[PDB]
Design an enzyme around this catalytic site. Sequence first.
Site, PDB file in Angstrom:
ATOM      1  N   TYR A   4     -38.981 -32.944   8.972  1.00  0.00           N
ATOM      2  CA  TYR A   4     -38.594 -32.826  10.411  1.00  0.00           C
ATOM      3  C   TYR A   4     -37.571 -33.907  10.750  1.00  0.00           C
ATOM      4  CZ  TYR A   4     -38.817 -33.143  15.459  1.00  0.00           C
ATOM      5  OH  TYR A   4     -38.502 -33.188  16.800  1.00  0.00           O
TER       6      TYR A   4
ATOM      7  N   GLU B  70     -43.279 -28.253  21.884  1.00  0.00           N
ATOM      8  CA  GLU B  70     -43.373 -29.601  22.499  1.00  0.00           C
ATOM      9  C   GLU B  70     -44.472 -29.619  23.568  1.00  0.00           C
ATOM     10  OE1 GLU B  70     -41.032 -32.039  21.557  1.00  0.00           O
ATOM     11  OE2 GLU B  70     -42.638 -33.282  22.266  1.00  0.00           O
TER      12      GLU B  70
ATOM     13  N   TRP C 118     -48.181 -34.472  17.465  1.00  0.00           N
ATOM     14  CA  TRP C 118     -46.980 -33.666  17.101  1.00  0.00           C
ATOM     15  C   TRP C 118     -47.167 -33.019  15.725  1.00  0.00           C
ATOM     16  CZ3 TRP C 118     -41.872 -31.916  17.896  1.00  0.00           C
ATOM     17  CH2 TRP C 118     -41.156 -31.637  16.727  1.00  0.00           C
TER      18      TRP C 118
HETATM   19  C1  LIG Z   1     -43.126 -38.017  16.758  1.00  0.00           C
HETATM   20  N1  LIG Z   1     -42.499 -36.888  17.463  1.00  0.00           N
HETATM   21  C2  LIG Z   1     -41.412 -36.290  17.024  1.00  0.00           C
HETATM   22  N2  LIG Z   1     -40.778 -35.268  17.597  1.00  0.00           N
HETATM   23  C3  LIG Z   1     -41.241 -34.748  18.751  1.00  0.00           C
HETATM   24  N3  LIG Z   1     -40.609 -33.709  19.296  1.00  0.00           N
HETATM   25  C4  LIG Z   1     -42.400 -35.320  19.303  1.00  0.00           C
HETATM   26  N4  LIG Z   1     -43.138 -35.043  20.452  1.00  0.00           N
HETATM   27  C5  LIG Z   1     -44.078 -35.923  20.379  1.00  0.00           C
HETATM   28  N5  LIG Z   1     -44.068 -36.771  19.318  1.00  0.00           N
HETATM   29  C6  LIG Z   1     -42.956 -36.369  18.612  1.00  0.00           C
END
Ligand SMILES: Cn1cnc(N)c2ncnc1-2
Length: 187
Positions: free
Chosen positions: A16, A38, A46
């Site tokens: 990611y 999200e 996440w």
């Molecule tokens: C760690 N992280 C990465 N990407 C996102 N879109 C996230 N939303 C919450 N926490 C996230």
Amino acid sequence: MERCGWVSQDPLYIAYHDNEWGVPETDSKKLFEMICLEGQQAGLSWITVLKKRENYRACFHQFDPVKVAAMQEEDVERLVQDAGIIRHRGKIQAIIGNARAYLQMEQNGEPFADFVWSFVNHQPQMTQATTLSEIPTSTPASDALSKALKKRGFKFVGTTICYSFMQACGLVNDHVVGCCCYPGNKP
Ligand SMILES: Cn1cnc(N)c2ncnc1-2
Ligand SMILES: [Zn+2]
């Protein structure tokens, strides 16, 4: 130089992190998918949703928000058994409602990326933070986003949801500054 804190956590985050941690401009279509996954991070992690993202897209592989507004509870009833995604018809019903709001913006002819990129003045934001703790979870653009989407009937848009969404979409650069090679210095 270290890259990201949740990156050294496991290979799944590395993918990611490398796939698109807010480096490419986003499209209105991807904006809808991002706010959907999200929104699930509310109270949830996440990564917990990330695994479900693979199974969820498999069933919702329709990539057509219009049909999503056509997906009724009968569809969520069978999906909780499809691949065994995050069983939770309640939260899933919220996803269907989110689609109706998608059509609401289209009836207005206003793309999701159009008003969002407008909140940041169609320009990228440079965060001067240094650690995840120094990263803000409530910025003026992120706060304006949640109240705006909330009005369109968009659920699961907590203040962290708007800020987390812009973080990976590409509107702002703020992994933690110094993430292996954070741009914005001379580029
Ligand atoms: C760690 N992280 C990465 N990407 C996102 N879109 C996230 N939303 C919450 N926490 C996230
Ligand atoms: Zn990073």
